[PDB]
């Protein structure tokens, strides 16, 4: 069996320019359980990433959170860029704080 | 009411070296220890800070176990490929999930032991703590030598004492957290999309547990079918957020309202953009 | 706690 991940990008707190905060990537229901996950900020990979344990849902699907800290600016651009089994090429979702 | 929770994965990887097993632990919707086979020292750690006060036995045991755990998940891997004749070239994994429910006299409400083996229904421990339920011949395989071998004895005697013992004491340990209910912080936004339509986001941060409901009403008419609402999602914190969007003819905004259902909140909570 | 029956084959 194999499910593609769903993918959020988003902060844990409400994004302030210039105020200190977290830039998460939660990836949930997806099978098999090798994922590749990257935080981007202008394209570019973020090297001090922590994810949380691998758990799984009750239909069987594995979920990671991907985080770190991070400060919002005006035209700093940040993303998540997902690898699967399941995707052909990597899926890149741009952070929007209004989501 | 109340529930401890164990999610044990093991996952071969040939050519990548021994199977990785991995354990995590919840009591509701916390998760409060971890065990990773691919850790620098590995061993049950804390992941709650109620937790944090176990002493060095209950570490140890517990590590003691998880390796236990992991040398017998990596020997079933082996049985599963024999079971389904499947090569030693592919990865292939094991998830288990076990646990107990309690009411909130602290009486087991019932206990859990269910699996799959590469995402698909396995066995599962009925919920007569006595009989198992088999997905396939594989499984029957199994479920034939565990009777045989009174697994399902063992199993209850786990499910109706030291777990809903320890849960218990879990449940009091850290009931400053478990057992407060922490309410959303909720506001609206408006987005316009053009000239003549705009988003309403309605959004709800930092709450537990993860159970809520976001509504968005117009004129008090329900318009589910027509919101968008993103799957609960961990904050990073232990809490969790959410949040639900319409997009709506510009000059209605005032019309519509956002509506919030949470443990944390003593009544429904009604929400509008305030511009 | 987790369980101590560690030791069961499939
Ligand atoms: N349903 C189920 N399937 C298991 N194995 C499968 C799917 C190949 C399995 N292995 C161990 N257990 C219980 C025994 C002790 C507890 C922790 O390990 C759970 C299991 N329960």
Redo the contacts with the bound molecule.
Sequence with gaps: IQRTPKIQVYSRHPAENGKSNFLNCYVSGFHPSDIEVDLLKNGERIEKVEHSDLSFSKDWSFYLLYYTEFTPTEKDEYACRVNHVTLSQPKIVKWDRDM | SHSMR?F?TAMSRPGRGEPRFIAVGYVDDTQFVRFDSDAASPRMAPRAPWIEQEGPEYWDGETRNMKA?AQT?RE?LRI?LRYYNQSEAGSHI?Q?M?GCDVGPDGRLLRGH?????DGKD????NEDLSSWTAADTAAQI?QRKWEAAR?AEQ?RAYLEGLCVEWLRRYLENGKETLQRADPPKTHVTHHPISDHEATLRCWALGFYPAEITLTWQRDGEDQTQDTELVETRPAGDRTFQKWAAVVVPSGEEQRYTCHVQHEGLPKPLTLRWEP | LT?K??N?N?
Excluded at chain 2, 113 to 117: I, L, M
Aim: proline residues 0%; aromatic residues 24%.
């Design positions: 164990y044990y755990s998940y079933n599963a094991i288990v076990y032991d269910q699996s799959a083996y396995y066995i599962a421990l199994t697994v199993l | 369980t029956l560690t069961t499939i």
